[PDB]
Amino acid sequence: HHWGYGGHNGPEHWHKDFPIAKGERQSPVDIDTHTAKYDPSLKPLSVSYDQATSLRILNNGHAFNVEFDDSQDKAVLKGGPLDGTYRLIQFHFHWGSLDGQGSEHTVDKKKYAAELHLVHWNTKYGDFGKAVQQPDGLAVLGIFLKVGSAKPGLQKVVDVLDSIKTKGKSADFTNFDPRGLLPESLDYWTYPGSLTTPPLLECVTWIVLKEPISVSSEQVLKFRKLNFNGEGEPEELMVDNWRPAQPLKNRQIKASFK
Ligand SMILES: [O-]
Ligand SMILES: [Zn+2]
């Protein structure tokens, strides 16, 4: 793999190695709030993170992942549009070089400064690698970030970044509680889509929260000091690691709220 978010290997190039980039169920998308339909049939999401076990944070060269123990049903997503039970495997963010861009989903073409993705896989498929091969294999909870007041539950993440500055670096990241990254409301939009990184597999039920969380400018500044590169290599700041909105095609975005 040689894809990234640079001047020569970014989203507009991905289709050469990953032709599904131009597919029928690609993410992210712009959410036109007037066209999304309230679906009174949709349930409240069930976000069950009480028993979550965070383990490690890893700079993978494109973002940082906070990894969880997904060997048992500890931290699970159920309900909403979903059937069955989806285990949290990791979360990460997408962000910009400046506050005016960074989110992958947009809302009436509005870009947020960043977007958090909590990635979960369907336990009926047994492992993550099997799940990504199935149309109902993943459930990703998307949460927008806007810049204003600090998010206290984010600071443990921001404080560790200096220890994983470069690609391939990891640090212990036990005892982190992802419930502190949620907004107050769980109202959401949902649609069928894909991973937003190569391999771009069309295996995701997207659940995007309507209420953004507020983070401080200092918190997002610290995301922007990370590096895409490896140790000792020419410094390339980890900024603008977002794929732009893709065509909606023959899809309907459903709202949980009226
Ligand atoms: O992603
Ligand atoms: Zn993501």
From Swiss-Prot:
UniProt binding sites for Zn(2+): 92, 94, 117
Site description Involved in the binding of some activators, including histamine and L-histidine, residues in chain: 90
Domain of life: Eukaryota
Resulting phenotype, residue 195 to F: Normal activity
Resulting phenotype, residue 3 to A: Impaired activity, not rescued by 4-methylimidazole (4-MI)
Residues reported in the UniProt entry to bind substrate: 196-197
EC nos: 4.2.1.1, 4.2.1.69
Record-linked PROSITE patterns: ALPHA_CA_1, ALPHA_CA_2
Recorded consequence of changing residue 60 to L: Reduced activity
pH profile: Optimum pH is 6-8.
UniProt effect for mutating residue 195 to E/H/R: Strongly reduced CO(2) hydrase activity
Main function: Catalyzes the reversible hydration of carbon dioxide. Can also hydrate cyanamide to urea. Stimulates the chloride-bicarbonate exchange activity of SLC26A6. Essential for bone resorption and osteoclast differentiation. Involved in the regulation of fluid secretion into the anterior chamber of the eye. Contributes to intracellular pH regulation in the duodenal upper villous epithelium during proton-coupled peptide absorption.
Protein name: Carbonic anhydrase 2
The organism of origin for this protein: Homo sapiens
